[PDB]
Copies of this chain bind each other. A is one copy, B any other.
Amino acid sequence: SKNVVIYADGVYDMLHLGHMKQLEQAKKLFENTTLIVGVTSDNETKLFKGQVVQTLEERTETLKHIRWVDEIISPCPWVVTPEFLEKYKIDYVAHDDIYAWLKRAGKFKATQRTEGVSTTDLIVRILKNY
């Protein structure tokens, strides 16, 4: 059963169970995989997405402790290109438009999120004590 290289990219700010289940899903897309995780730069995240709490180094250091993560590209490019796929021998991109070309190419694998499991939601829990 040949090894399949999966790439999942993202911010991974304040990593919670939702991220972890997505990473697990991507890791288990095939019997034998290498999961590469790409972690976005602080600047491109702020410019393109919004505020981020943790630094690149913090968000990357946390991901190193996750079981499903085989390799990390940090910082990663904001947009996936065909040359990037070729440079890293990537078979599929896992995420969940700017990946239409991956879908056209048969190189996109969708993964799902998990609601309520997040960090911001846990502070609410602490606060509901009042």
Contacts and interface: CB of A to CB of B under 8 A. Distances in A.
Interface of A: 14, 17, 20-21, 23-24, 53-54, 58, 61-62, 64-69, 117, 119, 122-123, 125-126
This protein's copies in its complex: 2
Given A66-B66, A67-B66, A67-B67, A61 B122 contact: no
Contact of A122 (B14, B64, B117): B14
Contacts of A58: 17, 117
A54 B20 contact: no
A56 B46 CA distance: 35
A76 to B, nearest CB: 20
A67 B54 CA distance: 21
